[PDB]
Write an enzyme that holds these catalytic residues in place. Structure first.
Site, short mmCIF file in Angstrom:
data_model
loop_
_atom_site.label_atom_id
_atom_site.label_comp_id
_atom_site.label_asym_id
_atom_site.label_seq_id
_atom_site.Cartn_x
_atom_site.Cartn_y
_atom_site.Cartn_z
N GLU A 35 1.61 57.25 70.70
CA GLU A 35 0.99 57.93 69.57
C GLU A 35 -0.29 57.22 69.09
O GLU A 35 -1.27 57.90 68.77
CB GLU A 35 2.00 58.05 68.42
CG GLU A 35 3.14 59.01 68.68
CD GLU A 35 2.74 60.44 68.80
OE1 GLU A 35 1.57 60.81 68.62
OE2 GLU A 35 3.69 61.25 69.14
N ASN A 46 -5.53 67.77 64.34
CA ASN A 46 -4.76 68.75 65.11
C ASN A 46 -5.52 70.08 65.14
O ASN A 46 -6.38 70.33 64.27
CB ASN A 46 -3.38 68.95 64.49
CG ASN A 46 -2.57 67.68 64.46
OD1 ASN A 46 -1.93 67.37 63.41
ND2 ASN A 46 -2.49 66.99 65.55
N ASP A 48 -4.73 73.03 64.28
CA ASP A 48 -4.51 73.85 63.10
C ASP A 48 -5.26 73.33 61.86
O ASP A 48 -5.16 73.94 60.82
CB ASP A 48 -2.98 74.04 62.82
CG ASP A 48 -2.25 72.74 62.39
OD1 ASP A 48 -2.87 71.65 62.32
OD2 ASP A 48 -1.02 72.80 62.07
N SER A 50 -4.53 70.35 60.39
CA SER A 50 -3.79 69.20 59.89
C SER A 50 -4.30 67.94 60.61
O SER A 50 -5.07 68.02 61.57
CB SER A 50 -2.29 69.40 60.10
OG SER A 50 -1.99 69.43 61.48
N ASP A 52 -2.92 63.86 61.92
CA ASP A 52 -1.86 62.90 62.18
C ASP A 52 -2.34 61.50 61.79
O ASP A 52 -3.47 61.12 62.09
CB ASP A 52 -1.51 62.87 63.65
CG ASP A 52 -0.57 63.95 64.09
OD1 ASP A 52 -0.11 64.79 63.30
OD2 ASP A 52 -0.29 63.90 65.30
N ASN A 59 2.25 63.91 60.64
CA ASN A 59 1.38 65.07 60.46
C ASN A 59 1.38 65.61 59.01
O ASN A 59 2.44 65.93 58.46
CB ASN A 59 1.82 66.13 61.45
CG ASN A 59 0.84 67.27 61.52
OD1 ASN A 59 -0.23 67.19 62.14
ND2 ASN A 59 1.15 68.27 60.81
N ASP A 101 15.28 65.71 60.79
CA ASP A 101 14.97 67.11 60.44
C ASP A 101 15.62 68.14 61.35
O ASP A 101 15.58 69.31 60.99
CB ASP A 101 13.44 67.28 60.39
CG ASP A 101 12.98 68.61 59.91
OD1 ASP A 101 13.19 68.92 58.75
OD2 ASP A 101 12.41 69.37 60.71
#
Ligand SMILES: [Cl-]
Ligand SMILES: [Cl-]
Ligand SMILES: [Cl-]
Ligand SMILES: [Cl-]
Ligand SMILES: [Cl-]
Ligand SMILES: [Cl-]
Ligand SMILES: [Cl-]
Ligand SMILES: [Cl-]
Ligand SMILES: [Cl-]
Ligand SMILES: [Cl-]
Ligand code: NA
EC number: 3.2.1.17
Length: 129
Positions: A35, A46, A48, A50, A52, A59, A101
């Site tokens: 990462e 990202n 979209d 967003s 990270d 995110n 999650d």
């Protein structure tokens, strides 16, 4: 801060990530390697819109507030900048929520693609733990 491999393993263990939700320490170190290359200051945008943040590339769509991700949530209740600190506490605490999650470590696509099913113990080999 750019952590050393064994240095990060040790920090993750002190913060209770070792075997958290059943994921051994090497899984977490492997995920951080791919990462962020162990760099707490890593950021990546990202598709979209967003972003990270940090060693585990958490995110802003769901987990932290950066003020520029429309319609997003802040489920870890933190500014995304907290995830860039040399102190990994905020990243670890938020990672614990993420991995809980429902999809485990598959939340990190790079873990699924690069770590899952591999000899992840190699990432902690030699380390004093
Ligand atoms: Cl640095
Ligand atoms: Cl080290
Ligand atoms: Cl390495
Ligand atoms: Cl391991
Ligand atoms: Cl926002
Ligand atoms: Cl929220
Ligand atoms: Cl905030
Ligand atoms: Cl730390
Ligand atoms: Cl799981
Ligand atoms: Cl991802
Ligand atoms: Na957000």
């Amino acid at each position: 801060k750019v952590f050393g491999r064994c240095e990060l393993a040790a920090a993750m263990k002190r913060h209770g990530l070792d075997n958290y939700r059943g994921y051994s320490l090497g899984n977490w170190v492997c995920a951080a390697k791919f990462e962020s290359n162990f760099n707490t200051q890593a950021t990546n945008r990202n598709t979209d819109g967003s972003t990270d943040y940090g060693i585990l590339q958490i995110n802003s769509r769901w987990w932290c507030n950066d003020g520029r991700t429309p319609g997003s949530r802040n489920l870890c209740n933190i500014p995304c900048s907290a995830l860039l600190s040399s102190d990994i506490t905020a990243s670890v605490n938020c990672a614990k929520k993420i991995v809980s999650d429902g999809n485990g470590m598959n939340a990190w696509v790079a873990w699924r693609n690069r770590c899952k099913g591999t000899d992840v113990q190699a990432w902690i080999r030699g380390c004093r733990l």
